[PDB]
Symmetry: C4
């Protein structure tokens, strides 16, 4: 398993949508969608929210007015799995730098005293056997 | 309740302002605010700050010179209830993955020794009952 | 007293800079820096990094070629005292929604047994006198 | 060394890349890469994703087709070694306003009852040497 597991999913979405868009727009916007290789570029350009609608979406949507859905969704999904991936890094850093190291520094402190108690206990019971061996001796 | 509760709120702010925009600018920016759906689009774009100002705000502000307040507010609000949503996940995931788990492991490893303590205590007053039972017997 | 103290500071930076730019560029970029309240806009737009350079800076810098330091520094400072403020919310949220109620659950779980151990102690000294009065009573 | 150590790294990449693009695009794109401190600029602008591609890269890629790798990877690398640094601020901020304080108040609270325990044991042992000097007396 892993984080670099969404970066697979994401790089899947990235490919999924790239070809999806070559299929539609390569037709009429052959500089943006003319090949797969430009889609990849344009889709990275588009993920980076740089003249995404004004530049690309609008004039495409100019053509295929439903294209909006294609652009909007892509952005939603794309950026959103980066949020899930940006988070994956916050977590697997924020419960790694401190929380995996204390995670065991108090897993160790705590069992370093069920060790003191359970000996102290054993000590008081060799007291009870020494005392209760002197109501059986008085 | 929930954090998919601000996703309701946001998706109202978004519809509020969409109808606000359409009612206003539909008139003279009918490309952007021509329909409710048109503004729903524009405002996604404005939210993604992609030629948001140079593209939409400023030209809407030339015509309607107070629209800045509209646009700057919508941005401030919308984006702000995403910061309020983006953290709604770093929290609900950073204290759900590390700190829901330990929350019970140290809730446990503490109440596991009110066990050892309160029983070992008992052992001592059973010893105190056996010894004080032998100054009243010596 | 709080996080809104940078909000103040950042609302300072915003004001200082909006005047400095009015005094400089009002002159030749009046639409952007003509009034105070339009440098306020323009620097809201600069802060949002929307056509920031290619739309404002490049042009201002065509004219005044040291204005770069102005823009860059503003951006740096601005988005930095925001990174500073953005975090002053993850922090003031992640040790407030979890690390505040535990912070008192196990400052209280702790002091619930300096109050057991320290009763258990006496009860053991009360066994040390009643026994130490039996090497002298034997 | 730490957060400010990737600021060295980032400030490395930034430099690396600037001279590269000056040794490359200084020729044909001299507004952006004519000099060093124009690549330094353009690169800042390119980093902040302001017209990075439609403005710079796409036209640079109009000259040199492979130039794409140059801008993509700068963004990938650059923006990435800030995710790395941004996060190095939530971390070295998160477990530092709440967790460099508790990790010592709980290094302490634990150490104050190795001290309670330890003295209690001794108290039990001296209780034992007293009892065990009373099998041998009775
Ligand atoms: Ca533009
Ligand atoms: Ca149009
Ligand atoms: Ca904790
Ligand atoms: Ca005007
Ligand atoms: Ca020029
Ligand atoms: Ca050209
Ligand atoms: Ca404890």
């Amino acid at each position: 398993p892993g984080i670099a597991w969404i970066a697979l999913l994401l790089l899947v979405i990235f490919y999924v949508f790239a070809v999806m868009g070559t299929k539609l727009f390569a037709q009429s916007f052959p500089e943006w969608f003319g090949t797969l290789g430009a889609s990849m570029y344009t889709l990275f350009q588009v993920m980076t929210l740089e003249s995404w609608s004004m530049g690309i979406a609008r004039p495409v949507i100019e053509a295929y007015p439903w294209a909006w859905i294609y652009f909007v969704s892509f952005i939603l999904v794309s950026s959103f799995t980066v949020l899930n991936l940006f988070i994956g890094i916050i977590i697997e850093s924020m419960q790694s730098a401190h929380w995996e190291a204390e995670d065991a520094k108090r897993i160790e402190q705590e069992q370093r005293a069920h060790d003191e108690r359970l000996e102290m206990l054993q000590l008081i019971r060799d007291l009870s056997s020494k005392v209760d061996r002197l109501e059986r001796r008085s």
